[model samples]
Target: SFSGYLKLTDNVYIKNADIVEEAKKVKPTVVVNAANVYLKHGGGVAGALNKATNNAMQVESDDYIATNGPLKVGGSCVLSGHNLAKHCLHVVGPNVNKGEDIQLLKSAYENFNQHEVLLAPLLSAGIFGADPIHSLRVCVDTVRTNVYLAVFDKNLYDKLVSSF
Candidate 1:
Protein backbone atom coordinates (compact mmCIF):
# COMPACT_ATOMS: atom_id res chain seq x y z
CA SER A 1 0.00 0.00 0.00
CA PHE A 2 1.13 3.61 -0.58
CA SER A 3 2.48 5.32 2.50
CA GLY A 4 2.08 8.82 1.08
CA TYR A 5 0.49 10.57 -1.88
CA LEU A 6 0.84 13.98 -3.58
CA LYS A 7 -0.98 15.16 -6.66
CA LEU A 8 1.35 16.93 -9.05
CA THR A 9 -1.34 17.52 -11.66
CA ASP A 10 -4.66 16.10 -12.72
CA ASN A 11 -2.71 13.25 -14.30
CA VAL A 12 0.29 12.76 -12.07
CA TYR A 13 0.67 11.68 -8.45
CA ILE A 14 3.55 10.63 -6.22
CA LYS A 15 3.20 7.54 -4.03
CA ASN A 16 5.54 5.92 -1.57
CA ALA A 17 5.70 2.22 -2.36
CA ASP A 18 7.89 -0.52 -3.76
CA ILE A 19 7.36 -0.18 -7.48
CA VAL A 20 7.64 -3.91 -8.16
CA GLU A 21 5.03 -4.74 -5.55
CA GLU A 22 2.74 -1.95 -6.66
CA ALA A 23 3.00 -3.08 -10.24
CA LYS A 24 1.74 -6.49 -9.21
CA LYS A 25 -1.26 -4.93 -7.51
CA VAL A 26 -2.06 -1.95 -9.75
CA LYS A 27 -1.16 -3.56 -13.10
CA PRO A 28 -0.71 -0.26 -14.87
CA THR A 29 -0.40 -0.25 -18.62
CA VAL A 30 3.33 0.00 -18.24
CA VAL A 31 6.04 0.18 -15.62
CA VAL A 32 8.90 2.56 -16.26
CA ASN A 33 12.33 0.98 -15.88
CA ALA A 34 15.01 3.50 -15.00
CA ALA A 35 17.40 1.77 -17.28
CA ASN A 36 20.98 2.29 -18.35
CA VAL A 37 21.84 3.27 -21.92
CA TYR A 38 22.69 -0.34 -22.63
CA LEU A 39 19.40 -1.43 -21.09
CA LYS A 40 20.99 -3.96 -18.81
CA HIS A 41 18.83 -5.18 -15.95
CA GLY A 42 21.82 -5.48 -13.66
CA GLY A 43 20.59 -3.70 -10.55
CA GLY A 44 18.20 -1.22 -8.98
CA VAL A 45 14.70 -0.83 -10.39
CA ALA A 46 15.68 -2.61 -13.59
CA GLY A 47 16.94 -5.57 -11.63
CA ALA A 48 13.79 -5.92 -9.58
CA LEU A 49 11.57 -5.87 -12.64
CA ASN A 50 13.75 -8.42 -14.37
CA LYS A 51 13.70 -10.69 -11.36
CA ALA A 52 9.96 -10.43 -11.04
CA THR A 53 9.56 -11.57 -14.61
CA ASN A 54 12.04 -14.39 -14.09
CA ASN A 55 14.66 -12.70 -16.28
CA ALA A 56 12.45 -12.64 -19.36
CA MET A 57 12.63 -8.87 -19.32
CA GLN A 58 16.41 -9.08 -19.48
CA VAL A 59 16.23 -11.43 -22.44
CA GLU A 60 14.08 -9.00 -24.32
CA SER A 61 16.30 -6.10 -23.34
CA ASP A 62 19.33 -7.91 -24.68
CA ASP A 63 17.58 -8.77 -27.91
CA TYR A 64 16.33 -5.22 -28.24
CA ILE A 65 19.82 -3.78 -28.00
CA ALA A 66 21.22 -6.39 -30.35
CA THR A 67 18.69 -5.33 -32.96
CA ASN A 68 17.88 -1.68 -32.33
CA GLY A 69 21.23 -0.66 -30.78
CA PRO A 70 21.85 0.79 -27.36
CA LEU A 71 19.15 3.18 -26.13
CA LYS A 72 20.53 6.70 -25.97
CA VAL A 73 20.09 9.07 -23.06
CA GLY A 74 16.47 10.25 -22.91
CA GLY A 75 15.60 7.43 -25.29
CA SER A 76 13.25 4.51 -24.62
CA CYS A 77 12.07 1.18 -25.97
CA VAL A 78 9.06 -0.89 -25.02
CA LEU A 79 9.15 -4.57 -24.15
CA SER A 80 6.47 -7.12 -23.39
CA GLY A 81 5.88 -7.41 -19.69
CA HIS A 82 5.88 -10.66 -17.75
CA ASN A 83 4.29 -11.19 -14.33
CA LEU A 84 3.81 -7.45 -14.10
CA ALA A 85 2.14 -4.82 -16.25
CA LYS A 86 1.22 -5.17 -19.90
CA HIS A 87 4.46 -3.45 -20.95
CA CYS A 88 7.76 -2.24 -19.65
CA LEU A 89 9.08 1.10 -20.86
CA HIS A 90 12.83 1.12 -20.52
CA VAL A 91 14.15 4.68 -20.43
CA VAL A 92 17.71 5.93 -20.21
CA GLY A 93 18.12 9.00 -18.07
CA PRO A 94 21.06 11.41 -18.10
CA ASN A 95 24.09 10.93 -15.93
CA VAL A 96 24.57 14.32 -14.35
CA ASN A 97 28.30 13.90 -13.67
CA LYS A 98 28.88 13.69 -17.41
CA GLY A 99 27.57 17.26 -17.73
CA GLU A 100 24.43 15.98 -19.37
CA ASP A 101 21.55 18.42 -19.16
CA ILE A 102 18.51 17.68 -17.01
CA GLN A 103 16.48 18.22 -20.16
CA LEU A 104 17.45 14.69 -21.14
CA LEU A 105 15.95 13.48 -17.89
CA LYS A 106 12.81 15.49 -18.56
CA SER A 107 12.55 13.98 -22.00
CA ALA A 108 12.80 10.51 -20.47
CA TYR A 109 9.62 11.15 -18.52
CA GLU A 110 7.93 12.90 -21.42
CA ASN A 111 8.68 10.01 -23.76
CA PHE A 112 6.45 7.62 -21.79
CA ASN A 113 3.52 9.97 -21.22
CA GLN A 114 1.55 8.37 -24.01
CA HIS A 115 0.62 5.43 -21.80
CA GLU A 116 -2.71 5.91 -20.05
CA VAL A 117 -1.49 4.53 -16.74
CA LEU A 118 2.21 4.43 -16.00
CA LEU A 119 4.10 3.46 -12.86
CA ALA A 120 7.46 5.21 -12.88
CA PRO A 121 10.41 5.39 -10.56
CA LEU A 122 12.75 8.28 -9.79
CA LEU A 123 14.82 8.17 -12.94
CA SER A 124 18.59 8.67 -12.91
CA ALA A 125 18.65 9.02 -9.14
CA GLY A 126 20.64 5.89 -8.40
CA ILE A 127 23.74 4.68 -10.24
CA PHE A 128 23.27 7.33 -12.93
CA GLY A 129 23.99 9.81 -10.14
CA ALA A 130 21.47 12.52 -10.87
CA ASP A 131 20.26 14.54 -7.92
CA PRO A 132 17.12 12.89 -6.52
CA ILE A 133 15.32 16.14 -5.83
CA HIS A 134 16.00 17.47 -9.29
CA SER A 135 15.02 14.17 -10.88
CA LEU A 136 11.74 14.14 -8.91
CA ARG A 137 11.11 17.74 -9.97
CA VAL A 138 11.50 16.80 -13.61
CA CYS A 139 9.07 13.90 -13.11
CA VAL A 140 6.54 16.15 -11.43
CA ASP A 141 6.78 18.73 -14.19
CA THR A 142 6.76 16.47 -17.24
CA VAL A 143 4.01 13.91 -16.74
CA ARG A 144 0.96 14.57 -18.89
CA THR A 145 -0.81 11.22 -18.74
CA ASN A 146 -2.09 9.26 -15.75
CA VAL A 147 1.18 8.59 -13.95
CA TYR A 148 2.19 7.41 -10.51
CA LEU A 149 5.63 8.01 -9.07
CA ALA A 150 6.49 4.72 -7.33
CA VAL A 151 9.00 5.94 -4.82
CA PHE A 152 10.77 3.12 -2.89
CA ASP A 153 12.87 5.08 -0.43
CA LYS A 154 11.34 6.40 2.75
CA ASN A 155 13.71 9.35 3.01
CA LEU A 156 13.16 10.39 -0.57
CA TYR A 157 9.40 9.99 -0.13
CA ASP A 158 9.47 12.19 2.94
CA LYS A 159 11.57 14.80 1.18
CA LEU A 160 9.25 14.78 -1.83
CA VAL A 161 6.15 15.06 0.34
CA SER A 162 7.65 18.00 2.22
CA SER A 163 8.93 19.77 -0.90
CA PHE A 164 5.54 19.73 -2.57
Candidate 2:
Protein backbone atom coordinates (compact mmCIF):
# COMPACT_ATOMS: atom_id res chain seq x y z
CA SER A 1 0.00 0.00 0.00
CA PHE A 2 2.96 2.27 0.30
CA SER A 3 3.46 4.86 -2.45
CA GLY A 4 5.20 8.11 -3.25
CA TYR A 5 6.61 11.03 -1.25
CA LEU A 6 5.83 14.64 -0.49
CA LYS A 7 7.85 17.42 1.07
CA LEU A 8 5.80 19.35 3.56
CA THR A 9 8.40 21.97 4.26
CA ASP A 10 12.06 22.61 3.66
CA ASN A 11 13.07 19.78 5.97
CA VAL A 12 10.00 17.64 6.61
CA TYR A 13 9.56 14.73 4.19
CA ILE A 14 6.51 12.51 3.94
CA LYS A 15 6.45 9.24 2.04
CA ASN A 16 4.45 6.09 1.61
CA ALA A 17 7.55 4.06 2.32
CA ASP A 18 8.35 1.12 4.53
CA ILE A 19 8.91 2.51 8.02
CA VAL A 20 10.93 -0.39 9.39
CA GLU A 21 13.32 -0.32 6.46
CA GLU A 22 13.73 3.43 6.64
CA ALA A 23 14.42 3.41 10.36
CA LYS A 24 16.95 0.61 10.03
CA LYS A 25 18.96 2.64 7.57
CA VAL A 26 18.66 6.05 9.19
CA LYS A 27 18.68 5.11 12.87
CA PRO A 28 16.47 8.03 13.69
CA THR A 29 17.00 10.04 16.82
CA VAL A 30 13.31 9.63 17.60
CA VAL A 31 10.42 7.47 16.50
CA VAL A 32 7.02 9.06 16.99
CA ASN A 33 3.75 7.24 17.50
CA ALA A 34 0.25 8.57 17.46
CA ALA A 35 -1.06 7.07 20.66
CA ASN A 36 -3.79 7.15 23.25
CA VAL A 37 -3.72 8.81 26.67
CA TYR A 38 -3.06 5.41 28.19
CA LEU A 39 -0.02 4.46 26.10
CA LYS A 40 -1.61 1.38 24.59
CA HIS A 41 0.88 0.49 21.94
CA GLY A 42 -1.19 -2.43 20.76
CA GLY A 43 -2.32 -1.21 17.34
CA GLY A 44 -1.45 1.04 14.44
CA VAL A 45 1.92 2.72 14.22
CA ALA A 46 2.38 2.57 17.96
CA GLY A 47 1.96 -1.18 17.87
CA ALA A 48 4.45 -1.45 15.05
CA LEU A 49 7.02 0.48 17.01
CA ASN A 50 6.24 -1.60 20.03
CA LYS A 51 7.01 -4.73 18.09
CA ALA A 52 10.10 -3.22 16.49
CA THR A 53 11.66 -2.35 19.83
CA ASN A 54 10.68 -5.68 21.37
CA ASN A 55 8.55 -4.36 24.26
CA ALA A 56 11.01 -1.63 25.12
CA MET A 57 8.27 0.79 24.12
CA GLN A 58 5.87 -0.91 26.47
CA VAL A 59 8.14 -0.45 29.48
CA GLU A 60 8.81 3.17 28.69
CA SER A 61 5.21 3.89 27.76
CA ASP A 62 3.87 2.46 30.99
CA ASP A 63 6.31 4.61 32.96
CA TYR A 64 6.17 7.68 30.62
CA ILE A 65 9.78 8.82 31.21
CA ALA A 66 8.78 12.53 31.11
CA THR A 67 10.43 12.90 27.74
CA ASN A 68 7.09 12.02 25.95
CA GLY A 69 1.75 11.04 26.83
CA PRO A 70 -0.48 9.44 29.11
CA LEU A 71 -1.77 13.00 29.42
CA LYS A 72 -4.64 15.14 28.23
CA VAL A 73 -4.69 17.12 25.00
CA GLY A 74 -1.59 19.31 24.68
CA GLY A 75 0.51 16.77 26.53
CA SER A 76 3.03 14.08 25.50
CA CYS A 77 5.17 11.27 26.93
CA VAL A 78 8.69 10.11 26.10
CA LEU A 79 10.39 6.72 26.24
CA SER A 80 13.83 5.27 25.58
CA GLY A 81 14.19 1.74 24.26
CA HIS A 82 16.42 -0.62 22.32
CA ASN A 83 16.62 -1.27 18.54
CA LEU A 84 14.02 1.26 17.48
CA ALA A 85 15.63 4.59 18.22
CA LYS A 86 17.05 6.69 20.98
CA HIS A 87 13.60 7.85 22.06
CA CYS A 88 9.94 7.13 21.43
CA LEU A 89 7.61 10.12 21.57
CA HIS A 90 4.02 9.20 22.12
CA VAL A 91 1.31 11.82 21.79
CA VAL A 92 -2.39 11.42 22.28
CA GLY A 93 -4.48 12.14 19.23
CA PRO A 94 -8.02 13.42 19.43
CA ASN A 95 -10.57 10.77 18.59
CA VAL A 96 -12.93 13.53 17.64
CA ASN A 97 -11.89 16.87 16.24
CA LYS A 98 -12.45 19.06 19.28
CA GLY A 99 -10.65 21.94 17.59
CA GLU A 100 -7.67 21.43 19.86
CA ASP A 101 -6.17 18.41 18.13
CA ILE A 102 -3.52 20.56 16.51
CA GLN A 103 -2.44 21.98 19.82
CA LEU A 104 -2.13 18.56 21.37
CA LEU A 105 -0.25 17.17 18.42
CA LYS A 106 2.16 20.08 18.44
CA SER A 107 2.82 19.57 22.12
CA ALA A 108 4.23 16.14 21.22
CA TYR A 109 7.29 17.80 19.82
CA GLU A 110 7.83 20.15 22.75
CA ASN A 111 9.89 17.70 24.74
CA PHE A 112 11.84 16.46 21.75
CA ASN A 113 15.62 16.35 22.23
CA GLN A 114 16.43 18.63 19.30
CA HIS A 115 16.98 15.58 17.15
CA GLU A 116 18.04 16.11 13.59
CA VAL A 117 16.13 13.17 12.18
CA LEU A 118 12.83 11.55 13.13
CA LEU A 119 10.51 8.90 11.69
CA ALA A 120 6.76 8.44 12.15
CA PRO A 121 3.58 7.38 10.45
CA LEU A 122 0.38 9.15 9.53
CA LEU A 123 -0.87 9.88 13.05
CA SER A 124 -4.46 10.07 14.23
CA ALA A 125 -5.66 7.99 11.30
CA GLY A 126 -5.89 4.66 13.07
CA ILE A 127 -7.43 4.07 16.47
CA PHE A 128 -7.68 7.79 17.14
CA GLY A 129 -9.71 8.18 13.90
CA ALA A 130 -8.91 11.87 13.62
CA ASP A 131 -8.17 13.65 10.37
CA PRO A 132 -4.73 12.84 8.97
CA ILE A 133 -4.46 16.26 7.35
CA HIS A 134 -4.84 18.00 10.68
CA SER A 135 -2.57 15.61 12.60
CA LEU A 136 0.18 15.88 10.00
CA ARG A 137 -0.21 19.62 9.72
CA VAL A 138 0.81 20.05 13.31
CA CYS A 139 3.75 17.75 12.68
CA VAL A 140 5.07 19.95 9.88
CA ASP A 141 4.67 23.07 11.93
CA THR A 142 6.33 21.83 15.07
CA VAL A 143 9.01 19.29 14.15
CA ARG A 144 12.22 21.19 13.39
CA THR A 145 14.12 18.10 12.29
CA ASN A 146 14.14 16.18 9.06
CA VAL A 147 10.95 14.15 9.40
CA TYR A 148 10.18 11.08 7.33
CA LEU A 149 6.52 10.14 7.29
CA ALA A 150 5.31 6.73 6.10
CA VAL A 151 1.85 6.98 4.64
CA PHE A 152 0.18 4.08 2.80
CA ASP A 153 -3.00 5.73 1.69
CA LYS A 154 -2.98 7.60 -1.58
CA ASN A 155 -6.05 9.55 -0.55
CA LEU A 156 -4.23 10.61 2.59
CA TYR A 157 -1.24 11.67 0.54
CA ASP A 158 -3.33 13.84 -1.74
CA LYS A 159 -5.02 15.47 1.20
CA LEU A 160 -1.60 16.15 2.79
CA VAL A 161 -0.39 17.96 -0.31
CA SER A 162 -3.22 20.47 -0.11
CA SER A 163 -3.03 20.69 3.67
CA PHE A 164 0.33 22.43 3.46
Candidate 3:
Protein backbone atom coordinates (compact mmCIF):
# COMPACT_ATOMS: atom_id res chain seq x y z
CA SER A 1 0.00 0.00 0.00
CA PHE A 2 2.77 2.49 0.86
CA SER A 3 4.55 2.71 -2.45
CA GLY A 4 5.13 5.04 -5.46
CA TYR A 5 5.41 8.65 -4.38
CA LEU A 6 5.64 7.34 -0.84
CA LYS A 7 9.17 6.22 -1.60
CA LEU A 8 10.60 9.67 -2.26
CA THR A 9 13.54 9.65 0.13
CA ASP A 10 16.28 7.05 0.56
CA ASN A 11 15.92 3.96 2.76
CA VAL A 12 18.20 5.48 5.38
CA TYR A 13 15.82 8.40 5.73
CA ILE A 14 12.62 6.34 5.55
CA LYS A 15 13.76 3.30 7.50
CA ASN A 16 15.35 5.26 10.32
CA ALA A 17 12.30 7.45 10.80
CA ASP A 18 11.27 5.87 14.05
CA ILE A 19 14.71 5.60 15.55
CA VAL A 20 16.10 8.89 14.35
CA GLU A 21 13.53 10.67 16.47
CA GLU A 22 14.65 14.32 16.24
CA ALA A 23 16.78 14.99 13.21
CA LYS A 24 20.43 15.05 14.31
CA LYS A 25 22.24 16.77 11.48
CA VAL A 26 20.03 17.44 8.44
CA LYS A 27 16.69 18.19 10.15
CA PRO A 28 15.14 15.09 8.64
CA THR A 29 11.39 15.10 7.98
CA VAL A 30 11.07 11.86 9.95
CA VAL A 31 10.34 13.75 13.14
CA VAL A 32 6.87 12.94 14.47
CA ASN A 33 4.35 15.71 13.89
CA ALA A 34 2.95 15.53 17.41
CA ALA A 35 -0.25 15.50 15.38
CA ASN A 36 -1.34 12.75 12.95
CA VAL A 37 -0.45 9.44 11.30
CA TYR A 38 0.66 6.49 13.41
CA LEU A 39 2.63 4.51 10.93
CA LYS A 40 3.90 0.96 11.29
CA HIS A 41 7.18 2.85 11.43
CA GLY A 42 8.62 6.35 10.95
CA GLY A 43 8.47 9.18 13.49
CA GLY A 44 5.02 10.76 12.79
CA VAL A 45 3.32 13.89 11.50
CA ALA A 46 4.85 17.14 12.84
CA GLY A 47 1.94 19.58 13.31
CA ALA A 48 -1.79 20.39 13.07
CA LEU A 49 -3.91 19.60 10.05
CA ASN A 50 -5.31 22.23 7.69
CA LYS A 51 -8.68 23.67 8.73
CA ALA A 52 -9.75 24.78 5.26
CA THR A 53 -9.15 21.24 3.98
CA ASN A 54 -10.34 18.96 6.71
CA ASN A 55 -13.84 20.30 7.42
CA ALA A 56 -13.09 18.91 10.88
CA MET A 57 -9.79 18.50 12.65
CA GLN A 58 -9.02 15.38 14.68
CA VAL A 59 -9.10 15.49 18.45
CA GLU A 60 -7.49 12.80 20.57
CA SER A 61 -8.78 11.00 23.67
CA ASP A 62 -7.94 14.25 25.43
CA ASP A 63 -9.83 16.22 22.78
CA TYR A 64 -6.52 17.56 21.54
CA ILE A 65 -5.89 18.47 17.90
CA ALA A 66 -3.22 15.80 17.44
CA THR A 67 -4.34 12.41 18.66
CA ASN A 68 -1.93 9.61 19.38
CA GLY A 69 -4.48 7.21 17.92
CA PRO A 70 -4.47 5.02 14.88
CA LEU A 71 -4.80 6.86 11.60
CA LYS A 72 -8.45 7.41 10.80
CA VAL A 73 -8.89 5.21 7.76
CA GLY A 74 -10.60 6.86 4.78
CA GLY A 75 -11.33 10.08 6.61
CA SER A 76 -11.52 13.41 4.78
CA CYS A 77 -11.68 16.57 6.85
CA VAL A 78 -11.88 20.00 5.20
CA LEU A 79 -9.50 20.99 7.98
CA SER A 80 -6.92 23.74 7.73
CA GLY A 81 -3.46 23.73 9.27
CA HIS A 82 -2.18 26.97 10.79
CA ASN A 83 -0.95 29.48 8.19
CA LEU A 84 -1.81 27.04 5.40
CA ALA A 85 -4.66 28.73 3.62
CA LYS A 86 -5.94 32.03 2.29
CA HIS A 87 -9.51 30.85 1.84
CA CYS A 88 -10.00 27.02 1.84
CA LEU A 89 -7.93 23.97 2.76
CA HIS A 90 -8.32 20.20 2.96
CA VAL A 91 -6.31 17.85 5.20
CA VAL A 92 -6.44 14.08 4.86
CA GLY A 93 -4.39 11.16 6.21
CA PRO A 94 -3.16 8.34 3.99
CA ASN A 95 -1.40 6.40 6.73
CA VAL A 96 2.22 6.66 7.89
CA ASN A 97 5.31 6.12 5.74
CA LYS A 98 3.96 8.34 2.95
CA GLY A 99 6.27 10.88 1.28
CA GLU A 100 4.05 11.77 -1.64
CA ASP A 101 1.51 13.73 0.39
CA ILE A 102 4.11 16.31 1.46
CA GLN A 103 4.89 17.07 -2.19
CA LEU A 104 1.18 17.16 -2.84
CA LEU A 105 0.60 19.59 0.02
CA LYS A 106 3.36 21.82 -1.32
CA SER A 107 1.73 21.54 -4.73
CA ALA A 108 -1.58 22.52 -3.22
CA TYR A 109 0.03 25.57 -1.65
CA GLU A 110 1.84 26.43 -4.88
CA ASN A 111 -1.07 25.83 -7.24
CA PHE A 112 -3.55 27.69 -5.07
CA ASN A 113 -4.60 31.28 -5.93
CA GLN A 114 -7.57 33.69 -6.03
CA HIS A 115 -9.11 31.65 -8.81
CA GLU A 116 -8.44 27.96 -8.10
CA VAL A 117 -7.66 25.19 -5.54
CA LEU A 118 -10.52 22.77 -5.05
CA LEU A 119 -11.60 19.21 -4.20
CA ALA A 120 -10.97 17.39 -7.46
CA PRO A 121 -7.15 17.16 -7.37
CA LEU A 122 -7.11 17.08 -3.60
CA LEU A 123 -9.01 13.80 -3.76
CA SER A 124 -6.68 12.28 -6.33
CA ALA A 125 -3.42 12.55 -4.31
CA GLY A 126 -4.51 9.44 -2.45
CA ILE A 127 -6.17 11.66 0.18
CA PHE A 128 -9.38 9.59 -0.02
CA GLY A 129 -7.25 6.55 0.84
CA ALA A 130 -4.76 8.45 3.00
CA ASP A 131 -5.00 8.23 6.77
CA PRO A 132 -5.22 11.48 8.74
CA ILE A 133 -2.07 10.53 10.59
CA HIS A 134 -0.30 10.10 7.28
CA SER A 135 -1.74 13.25 5.77
CA LEU A 136 -0.55 15.21 8.76
CA ARG A 137 2.94 13.87 8.31
CA VAL A 138 2.86 14.67 4.63
CA CYS A 139 1.58 18.13 5.43
CA VAL A 140 4.76 18.81 7.35
CA ASP A 141 7.13 16.96 5.09
CA THR A 142 5.91 18.31 1.75
CA VAL A 143 4.17 21.60 2.45
CA ARG A 144 5.88 24.57 4.01
CA THR A 145 4.66 25.47 7.47
CA ASN A 146 3.97 29.06 6.44
CA VAL A 147 1.63 28.84 3.46
CA TYR A 148 1.70 32.03 1.40
CA LEU A 149 -1.65 32.64 -0.22
CA ALA A 150 -1.66 34.96 -3.21
CA VAL A 151 -3.57 38.16 -2.60
CA PHE A 152 -5.34 38.47 -5.90
CA ASP A 153 -8.49 40.31 -4.84
CA LYS A 154 -6.28 43.29 -3.86
CA ASN A 155 -8.43 44.14 -0.86
CA LEU A 156 -8.59 40.55 0.38
CA TYR A 157 -6.14 40.75 3.27
CA ASP A 158 -7.74 43.93 4.65
CA LYS A 159 -11.21 42.44 4.94
CA LEU A 160 -10.28 38.76 5.17
CA VAL A 161 -10.58 38.38 8.92
CA SER A 162 -13.50 40.83 9.15
CA SER A 163 -15.58 39.26 6.39
CA PHE A 164 -15.00 35.65 7.34
Candidate lDDT (C-alpha), each: 0.83, 0.67, 0.28
lDDT of 3 by residue, 1-164 (tens): 11112222221111112211212222322111222333221122222222221323233212333443443433222233323322223223332354444334434333222222121122222223443333333433543232222121224323432332
Q: Estimate each model's TM-score.
A: 0.91, 0.73, 0.21
Q: Who wins the TM-score comparison?
A: 1
Cα error, residue 22 of model 2, in Å, equals 2.4
Which runs in model 2 stand beyond 4 Å of their true positions? 1-5, 63-69, 97-103, 109-114, 162-164
Instruction: Count clashing residue pairs per candidate.
Output: 0, 5, 34
* Candidate 3 deviant stretches above 4 angstroms: 1-71, 87-90, 96-164
Candidate 1 clashes: the total is 0
Give residue 116's lDDT in candidate 2 (0 to 100).
68
- Give the Å error, residue 114, model 3: 16
In TM-score terms, candidate 2 sits at 0.73
The predicted structure with the larger TM-score, 1 or 3, is 1
TM-score of model 1 relative to the true fold? 0.91
TM-score for predicted model 3 compared with the true structure: 0.21
